[PDB]
Amino acid sequence: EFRPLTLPPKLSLSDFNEFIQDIIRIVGSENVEVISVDGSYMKPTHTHDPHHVMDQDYFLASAIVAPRNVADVQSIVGLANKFSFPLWPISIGRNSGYGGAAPRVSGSVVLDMGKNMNRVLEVNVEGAYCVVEPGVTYHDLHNYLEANNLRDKLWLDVPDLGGGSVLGNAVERGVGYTPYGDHWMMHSGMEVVLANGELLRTGMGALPDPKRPETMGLKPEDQPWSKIAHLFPYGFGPYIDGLFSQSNMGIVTKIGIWLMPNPGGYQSYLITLPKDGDLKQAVDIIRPLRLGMALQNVPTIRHILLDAAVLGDKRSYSSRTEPLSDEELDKIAKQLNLGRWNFYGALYGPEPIRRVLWETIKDAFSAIPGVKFYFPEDTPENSVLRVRDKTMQGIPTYDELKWIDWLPNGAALFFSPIAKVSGEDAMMQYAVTKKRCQEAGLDFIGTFTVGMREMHHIVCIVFNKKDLIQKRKVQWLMRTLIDDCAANGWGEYRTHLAFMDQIMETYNWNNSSFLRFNEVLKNAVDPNGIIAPGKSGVWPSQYSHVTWKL
Amino acid sequence: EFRPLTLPPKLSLSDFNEFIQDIIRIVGSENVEVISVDGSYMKPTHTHDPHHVMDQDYFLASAIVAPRNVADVQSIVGLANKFSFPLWPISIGRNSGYGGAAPRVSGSVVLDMGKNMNRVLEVNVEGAYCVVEPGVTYHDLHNYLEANNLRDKLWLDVPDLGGGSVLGNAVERGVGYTPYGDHWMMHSGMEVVLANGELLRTGMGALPDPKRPETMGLKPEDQPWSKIAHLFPYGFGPYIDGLFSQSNMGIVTKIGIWLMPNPGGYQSYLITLPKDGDLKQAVDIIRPLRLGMALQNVPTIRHILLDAAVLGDKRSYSSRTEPLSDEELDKIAKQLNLGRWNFYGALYGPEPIRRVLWETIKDAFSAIPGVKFYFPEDTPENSVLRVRDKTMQGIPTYDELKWIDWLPNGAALFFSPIAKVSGEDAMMQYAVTKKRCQEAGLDFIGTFTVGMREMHHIVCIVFNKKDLIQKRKVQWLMRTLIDDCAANGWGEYRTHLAFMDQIMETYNWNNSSFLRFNEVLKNAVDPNGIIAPGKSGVWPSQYSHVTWKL
Amino acid sequence: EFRPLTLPPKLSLSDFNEFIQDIIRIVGSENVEVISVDGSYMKPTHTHDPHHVMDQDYFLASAIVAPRNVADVQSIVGLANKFSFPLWPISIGRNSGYGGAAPRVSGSVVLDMGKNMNRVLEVNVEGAYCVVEPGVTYHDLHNYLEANNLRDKLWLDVPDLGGGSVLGNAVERGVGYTPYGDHWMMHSGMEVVLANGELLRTGMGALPDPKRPETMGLKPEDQPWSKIAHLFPYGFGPYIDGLFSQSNMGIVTKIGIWLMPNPGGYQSYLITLPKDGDLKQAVDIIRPLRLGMALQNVPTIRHILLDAAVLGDKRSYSSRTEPLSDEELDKIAKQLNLGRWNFYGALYGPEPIRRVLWETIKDAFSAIPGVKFYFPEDTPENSVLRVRDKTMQGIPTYDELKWIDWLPNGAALFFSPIAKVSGEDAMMQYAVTKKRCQEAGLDFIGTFTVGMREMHHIVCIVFNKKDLIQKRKVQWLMRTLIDDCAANGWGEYRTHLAFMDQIMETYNWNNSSFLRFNEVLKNAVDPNGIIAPGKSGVWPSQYSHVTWKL
Ligand SMILES: Cc1cc2nc3c(=O)[nH]c(=O)nc-3n(C[C@H](O)[C@H](O)[C@H](O)COP(=O)(O)OP(=O)(O)OC[C@H]3O[C@@H](n4cnc5c(N)ncnc54)[C@H](O)[C@@H]3O)c2cc1C
Ligand SMILES: Cc1cc2nc3c(=O)[nH]c(=O)nc-3n(C[C@H](O)[C@H](O)[C@H](O)COP(=O)(O)OP(=O)(O)OC[C@H]3O[C@@H](n4cnc5c(N)ncnc54)[C@H](O)[C@@H]3O)c2cc1C
Ligand SMILES: Cc1cc2nc3c(=O)[nH]c(=O)nc-3n(C[C@H](O)[C@H](O)[C@H](O)COP(=O)(O)OP(=O)(O)OC[C@H]3O[C@@H](n4cnc5c(N)ncnc54)[C@H](O)[C@@H]3O)c2cc1C
Incomplete structure (x- = not known):
């Protein structure tokens, strides 16, 4: 499609059109939608905030793109770096009360990870963990355990609703009500597409699974993980996992989440x-x-x-x-x-x-x-x-x-x-x-x-x-x-979304030392500032504060 | 003092001399030592590895500097950035089996944080936490609890020996044997001197304590912390705390560690x-x-x-x-x-x-x-x-x-x-x-x-x-x-120290994606590469891999 | 002299020593003072704030330098740009309640313009104006009018005390109580030494006095002014005069101030x-x-x-x-x-x-x-x-x-x-x-x-x-x-001085647009940030906000 309601900053209509044709050839016309309806919890919108505090169309995507797989997110990131097109990644888009699936910056492509990257990748009994993609909701993970009768050995930990995304929620550091309620602390082993488009796996996920005939020639995204990946989250060296929660430092494609054994009572x-x-x-x-x-x-x-x-x-x-x-x-x-x-x-x-x-x-x-x-x-x-x-x-x-x-x-x-x-x-x-x-x-x-x-x-x-x-x-x-x-x-x-700046301005001990450091980190890893600029108040340097802050 | 056994990379004897006179006027001659003895567990050495696997003088300090307080670390950091002098911060220097107090790079100043920055800053009973400086060994924290009779309400979590540093051990992600054994997971609220020399406090420590007459005019290092600083580690936005464990991204001056209530049996x-x-x-x-x-x-x-x-x-x-x-x-x-x-x-x-x-x-x-x-x-x-x-x-x-x-x-x-x-x-x-x-x-x-x-x-x-x-x-x-x-x-x-490069090389999934990312972060935050270069295999760009890796 | 209590940022003791010997040979030992006493209103201090709200030595000069004339300020400016030494210009140094003569940045040289650049340069009766140097206090201007019996034709406008500086007060936009009370609005024709060291005259002062035998060969600071310089402040083009009040954009060496005719009652x-x-x-x-x-x-x-x-x-x-x-x-x-x-x-x-x-x-x-x-x-x-x-x-x-x-x-x-x-x-x-x-x-x-x-x-x-x-x-x-x-x-x-950052933060309409613009101006004109950094909250880019703001 041809003419969006809002274009991202500094982008022409022709670049937008070239870009969208580029993505359409990568993912298909069925996985791309140009915005040229608040919906329900059942079929959440992915264009704007359904619980809109500002005007409905205030935070508005220019297009919604649904990658088919990790390779497609790598290609999309390349395109965004070529055209300087900001991406806004969502998993399920049900962040109700928090902006829903709307981007901070209007004109961004909303990146819908969850439509096609849906899989329950693994449920490990002896290690009491699961590995998941952006699209697995809590309801889906529940159905997966029930279909395989795993409910008798392992339990999930859910928020008040069941439609949210296990990975989505955990990277926001969401909360649940069993003894495994601290979602973010139950993770171990995440897969991320960096702003430069390179795949990275954290913790013990960086220790590669030894080679074997059966896994030779697999694309990186598709390789198995080494035995300790989802068991001990620290790995070796700097523990960089938290840089990816409530951040714009990367696009999380997979995550391991520890599961509580049936308690026997x-x-x-x-x-x-x-x-x-x-x-x-x-x-x-x-x-x-x-x-x-x-x-x-x-x-x-x-x-x-x-x-x-x-x-x-x-x-x-x-x-x-x-x-x-x-x-x-x-x-x-x-x-x-x-x-x-x-x-x-x-x-x-x-x-x-x-x-x-x-x-x-x-x-x-x-x-x-x-x-x-x-x-x-x-x-x-x-x-x-x-x-x-x-x-x-x-x-x-x-x-x-x-x-x-x-x-x-x-x-x-x-x-x-x-x-x-x-x-x-x-x-x-x-x-x-x-x-x-x-x-x-x-x-x-x-x-x-x-x-x-x-x-x-x-x-x-x-x-x-x-x-x-x-x-x-x-x-x-x-x-x-x-x-x-x-x-x-x-x-x-x-x-x-509308309160991010104000809330970050509140964590200003020692004259905002905390956001300056985030800023320094962000511009090193995203020199084109294409990954969700503005998320949590952290702006890449091409986004003037005078212009963009709320 | 005038002539060290080893000078840090690219530094002249005259710059070394200028620098050391500069440090002496900030901290005193009693707090600086030029290296022109393996010692004991009781009085650990701070010049080299006492459990030396390589030759004894293989990893060697040029001098030992003991900051009096946080302001002194800030000034020392400024000097190191002026002269490009690599600093190797230690708390107690008892990392026996791991190199002791020895720097990865010989010629570095060993920064002794523990000699003078020794204080148990706060022991909070309702929140069951303690706040500490590099110098508080587990034995010291224990004595602090005994002197005030807090043992009946709060217990510590210790490693096999008692002389280590509570903060030092914890930023290494050390282990203990009570239910509070995951030392690193028990932290909440750290204070860090960045490579640029700026003071930063993480988590809820970034939400400043509200002004009041009694705390007006206090240097940032000396300010109280807001009520939730040592109770919820996440704060808001990117959770950057882990960038400070097993890393060279900063110099940790204070940390809060959660303490277990007397279990009643x-x-x-x-x-x-x-x-x-x-x-x-x-x-x-x-x-x-x-x-x-x-x-x-x-x-x-x-x-x-x-x-x-x-x-x-x-x-x-x-x-x-x-x-x-x-x-x-x-x-x-x-x-x-x-x-x-x-x-x-x-x-x-x-x-x-x-x-x-x-x-x-x-x-x-x-x-x-x-x-x-x-x-x-x-x-x-x-x-x-x-x-x-x-x-x-x-x-x-x-x-x-x-x-x-x-x-x-x-x-x-x-x-x-x-x-x-x-x-x-x-x-x-x-x-x-x-x-x-x-x-x-x-x-x-x-x-x-x-x-x-x-x-x-x-x-x-x-x-x-x-x-x-x-x-x-x-x-x-x-x-x-x-x-x-x-x-x-x-x-x-x-x-x-001698195995750090070989161990980081092992965490090379996807062609070393994990270390490249760490490198990118480190050179943004340390453009002069003066904080502990080489720690965990992470090298600032001025340290050629061919030259420095083992 | 050799060793100051405080050195300006990033300056060594040797550069300080070189610099001070350089200044001593330009102005003499009698015009330079190294700080290695609150004083009175009568003989104001020039080293710190006598009405100290912070600790007495909180805002402290490293040295006091008294230029003999405009050429000396030019040379001092050149030296400060060579060494990156921050200058804090004062006229009389009686800004009591506002920091006195103290510099925002400790370690700065306090530039005492008033000791030697004292002259009532001209009192014009037909145009009812006077031209003055930093050192002319209101009491001095009063005595000048009395000695020549001009009190019957012209009156001054004074603040509550008489020792302040006519120019000093006016560039602060100070207030007086006759009909000529808006001091800053009564000015017309200022002379300024820019950060680059060039001499500039504003308004009609930029339209040079026509050549004549009697004024040939005079240094620019010593040239007469053209007839309309002190009569119409606007001149032609951008009216840049206000960039010099309550700012760090220049060092004011002379100013014309309009005087009220004896009102006849x-x-x-x-x-x-x-x-x-x-x-x-x-x-x-x-x-x-x-x-x-x-x-x-x-x-x-x-x-x-x-x-x-x-x-x-x-x-x-x-x-x-x-x-x-x-x-x-x-x-x-x-x-x-x-x-x-x-x-x-x-x-x-x-x-x-x-x-x-x-x-x-x-x-x-x-x-x-x-x-x-x-x-x-x-x-x-x-x-x-x-x-x-x-x-x-x-x-x-x-x-x-x-x-x-x-x-x-x-x-x-x-x-x-x-x-x-x-x-x-x-x-x-x-x-x-x-x-x-x-x-x-x-x-x-x-x-x-x-x-x-x-x-x-x-x-x-x-x-x-x-x-x-x-x-x-x-x-x-x-x-x-x-x-x-x-x-x-x-x-x-x-x-x-201690409230300047907090007060500029208050004038933050549209995400601080006003200070960003001031910053842009200041770094163009002072690329070394040597003129009074921090004055009014405006910081040259070499002065990290995290470090320096209060
Ligand atoms: C009635 C109600 C009750 C709720 N109860 C709870 C509760 O008990 N606990 C709770 O925690 N929340 C709760 N929420 C808040 C929110 O609705 C849930 O947290 C929900 O699961 C979050 O949305 P999501 O994870 O499906 O969607 P998403 O829209 O996917 O949100 C993910 C967000 O995190 C980031 N993100 C998501 N995926 C990625 C990725 N792949 N890469 C990078 N960044 C990514 C983006 O910033 C994005 O905005 C509730 C909301 C409502 C309306
Ligand atoms: C017999 C024996 C038994 C041991 N048992 C245990 C055990 O049960 N559990 C365990 O975890 N360890 C154990 N250790 C390993 C190690 O000795 C302890 O972890 C010890 O507490 C670590 O040293 P330290 O914390 O006192 O000293 P430090 O020398 O202070 O070491 C701190 C290290 O972390 C970094 N660091 C320290 N302080 C700072 C700071 N302020 N800023 C930035 N970086 C900093 C540096 O990389 C430095 O090398 C044992 C060692 C021996 C010899
Ligand atoms: C009891 C009392 C009463 C007061 N009453 C009044 C009043 O009625 N009205 C009023 O306005 N103030 C008043 N003041 C405030 C202040 O004391 C006066 O304005 C005083 O005249 C200002 O100091 P100064 O001009 O002598 O000194 P200076 O210390 O010279 O101050 C000049 C200031 O302006 C800048 N400056 C000065 N000279 C130059 C130059 N040559 N180039 C560049 N920048 C320069 C600097 O920022 C400097 O800090 C009062 C103060 C007290 C203690």
Whole structure:
């Protein structure tokens, strides 16, 4: 195709046309689409942000290209370096609340790795790992284990939804809820296409599999990996793996992710905390238990509107347009059999071990008046606990998508700071965020996900995407929250395309030493600045800061 | 001082003299030493390799410089960039078996960070972490916890000896034996002086501590850290921390290391395996247990000569000059009440939990004929179990230094490949290594340290450092082992100065893609190539490969 | 001399020594001083900041050099470009509250232009202007006019003290209180030594004086100026004069400043405003009057503690260590016969004209209850009005120096934002600043100086320079005020050395477009970055931002 809505920087329409003809001959007309529709979670869009906080077409691809295999990504990168065409690689494109599949720089080709590079490459039982391509979603990996009956020996670790990409999510350093919840720390052995187009394998993946007749003459992408590749992630020398997470330093084509053995015993549970103020005592209680491993997985503390929004839109609970009152939150809590805060967790391992920990957990949460303990069986058929019971054993579900429908044309945007695992800090973060949410006219909706020495506080901002006034309030909100949390010593761990610059500007100790160093690294490996310029605030030097920053 | 034995590359005697007068005025004559003695573990040398496999003066400093603080490192870096003088930073300089304090390039200044930058900067109880400077040895951190009575709340994780540096060891990705044994994975928040001399803090350390009257006007090195700096290592954007382990990308001035809470119950144990061939069954047994966490710490599988060498030199068991026979190893085993292989481990937590796991461990090791189970009380006063009982609870000891005295002027050199956690692989690596040791005329001495999905096999080569014939056999051995292990799909995780190029050459998948990328990074950040050139085989472009590689 | 406390960046001791011997042979040993004392207003220091907010030696010269004439500055510039030595030019060095004579970069040579380049070059009566060198203080220019009896034809315009430099103050865009109070707007024709060392004259000064026998053979610095040089500032083409105010783009050697003709009638006056809240009504009143020119000069609105501090230290009014209360300020007001706010002004011209405006002023201020009107005769012998009566007619005094002695070892630091000429805005800025001063534990002390469409609000922070705790609170205060005022839409017009980067960061519309442009200009004209690097936050490219910004 001939004429796109937006062309990448400094590129002419003829270069665009030459380039797109070049890619079409490499991958076929069925794997290329020129943009000359927000869609669904089911068939995500790959052209722009479906949960658009800015105008819909603000972050817009000029074309979508689907490589057939690693060789095609090498050729595409060569082309982009020839024409200076920025690429924006995506795996599944479901980064909802974070920009979706939209590029930071409009005019970029969205590189759709996941359409054709789909394979579950290996599932290794003795080493309890899997190797995967960008296109394997959590649902797909689950089906792979089920079809081969591997569920009895190995379990997966999934986020709240099941359509996301195992590799995609892990390179963003996403989180899950079993004891393998720290996705990025469970990796070992990644394959990357560098900006120069050279293939590179990290860790023990750089120690080549010894030659043998059966693997002679295979292209590098197609070679097997040496025995320790997916078992010990460090290899030898500088450990460069992290340069590839939340970065623009390369295109990840394959990754090994460690899988937990069936634990031989499982029990999910829900602890309802009656009062809004019970967050403080609960976190204080969670601290020592999470450090000493009575709390085995990544347990969450859900605010009552998160659960309420899973079960029904705002219209179903109130006809109010403004934020529900405190008294109304107590009525919704009572209506659903939940507290104002709901703690979700799971015990793993043999009964004798589950028993002891469970009594420790129970006994410690008993200092909170009115606490109530439930197992999935004890709750209604449509409960969040019955969904999270599946979630905390690695089974993918889609039920929790429903909270995005809290409002009319509900879109999501995530404010994601990190808090200490302390009631004092958690209340304070809450207090800060709640106050700005109410100034903005939005219900506070959020969850804390409990890590070992930190909690990821996901404030779920939901707004009407067809309401220009509220979109502007969301943007006012997000920007102020960033600043306020920064003034209180808290940083966000992951964000949307429009907030990357502002969030990187917050990590400016010693006059921005941290981004300068990233900048130095980036321009050495991408001298044409073709790999997703702007991702995380890191700009190659051909992208003036005055022009491009937000 | 005026005239060093060796000058760094391309530097004149006059530039050397100017430089050293420049350093003397910054740090004082007491903190600078010109080299115009192997020493002890007690007072390590900082001029060369005390366990010299090459000639003693092969790797030699021109001078030793001890910065007083971070400002001094900054100024020293500026001078090195002015004169193009290569710096070799050390923390404690006890990297015995790995080159000690010796620089890869002779003529380099050895930067002694540990003499004056010694401080335990902070021990945080609620967050269960500590922040430290290069000079805090494990023994020092231990004493710090004892003086303040923190041992009841927090434990350390130590390597076999206690004199090493907490930071030094951790940036080498060193290993320990409690559940916090993956030293590098326990870090969060590092401070680094870049090659350009700029101070940088990683992760959440880049999110500055909010201003307040009490901290106004403090030099950047002296500023407090924001609340989440030592609690969540990822921060935001590219996770660049790993670029600083086993690298020459920076000079680490401070690091945060997560500390394990007193577990409320501890019991070490020893499981003796009668036969040489029992390794295989044992590892096959260890696999599922380690994966399902019945084995909580990093348990080890010591070969009988390791324990034997701790208890007495070779002269005490035989007057032989050649390797002890198999029949002799069985006699030494019997004499000491140990098997041919000895498995050391520890159970953590409340009694009810220790009980269940201990029965699971017992029962699974029972499939090996003649297995015997000991607690420290059950063994003699000089046993390795009573020493390692301390070691698996983070208490520092120095007893295990005695195996370096197996031979007359015993020096150590470590051959450190990684193996799958499988009887088959472990036997095979053992077979390969044992064969080459006997060809070399040396006793096989070693340990396997059990990681989750891998084992670190430390073959401990001990030789007479005053025996030129054997030193040459050591070098013949090491180099052949590298190749043999590489030809069987195994790579080493850490190595000595003289083997770094050969070991990086082994991680050459796709025509050395991994080292080219490291080179690209290094020359961007060190355009004068003044930070430890050659470390891990990574050479700045001013250091011709033909000239410098070994 | 041989060994300075601090050397400029990247310079060796030997280059320093060579350089200083080179300068000594150009200007003599009497004109050069190596720094191997805070002093007084009378004999200002030229080595560091006498009103030090940071440690005393924080901003420190390596040497002081006093050029004999323009040729000497040219040669000094050549040497600095040869050695890359940063120069910090000063005229008188009395920039008290703004860093004094201290360089932004420590190690810089302080260039003392005023010691030897002292001359009143010309006082032209028909054109009502004067031409001056860096060393002509206002007191000196005053004496020059008196000696020749020119006071009857021409008046000066002075700042609160008389020792400052006419040129120095003017290139800082300093303010005065007659109708000629916008010092920078009264200039026409400047002479500058560029960074490359070339002499340049601006405006009509670029149109050379026609040749004539009497001026043949004169060095360029010594040539007369063409007739219109000091009469029309614009010249032809780009008007580049402003690139030389509050900048590091050149070294100003001579300037022409327009002088007001004796007005043929003068009467100063004081209007006391009883209440703290009367600021608002007063400013609302001042607005139309200032715009329609009933208020002819630059009238000021002094806070009661400013006048109180001129008359006696804090010990004389209270023995309190904390801020005086509101009730105490009313008592001090009553004691001195002043309001809580005191408006000082002056009427110029023939009696008939003074009469009419004076009735217009009186009548409009009459809407404020309790207002009282004084002429100098009506007040006591030690009043501020009798001092400012002199000040509003261009006569230099030193009386107002006494407010710096409010506290024990009182030092001054100025927080200088701009406010709209509106009661609403003025109160609001006052509210913001007063709140932060009380949190800091300091008395609020300040003045508003009334411009045509804006007011310069000088918050005069006075602190004990030997009190480390309060110095830190001063720094905490200053930095928070900057941010607070920025968050309310107000920027500072001038600042001290330690706040320059933070204040330039505030003028960051469109991703700092304004400073990028300044950077581009500066590196073209100073490729060695030797003229006052860092002045106003503008850094030559050899000065890494990470390293140098505060
Ligand atoms: C209701 C809801 C719930 C969510 N719950 C969770 C949760 O529990 N945990 C969680 O972590 N997230 C959660 N998310 C956030 C996000 O939706 C998921 O993390 C999702 O899996 C991320 O998208 P993806 O991995 O499918 O898609 P992708 O669009 O592939 O996103 C990948 C992103 O990482 C980079 N990237 C991806 N692939 C590559 C590659 N091959 N090479 C280089 N860079 C690459 C790019 O920066 C890109 O923007 C949730 C979102 C919603 C809407
Ligand atoms: C008998 C014996 C037993 C051992 N047992 C163990 C064991 O169980 N586990 C284990 O891991 N090791 C073991 N070691 C190996 C090694 O001796 C220890 O890891 C020791 O702690 C490493 O030295 P160090 O950390 O004190 O000293 P250092 O000499 O400080 O070594 C640090 C090294 O890392 C780098 N480095 C250090 N500090 C910095 C800095 N500030 N900035 C930049 N780079 C830096 C340099 O490359 C340097 O060579 C053993 C050694 C012997 C002789
Ligand atoms: C009690 C008190 C009251 C004050 N009242 C006033 C007031 O009413 N109005 C006011 O404006 N200020 C006031 N000031 C602020 C300041 O003290 C005066 O402006 C003073 O005249 C400025 O110093 P200077 O001009 O003598 O000295 P200098 O130290 O000469 O300062 C000149 C500055 O401008 C630059 N500069 C000077 N000469 C040159 C040159 N030749 N070439 C290039 N750059 C040059 C440099 O950046 C330098 O730092 C006051 C200060 C105090 C302590």
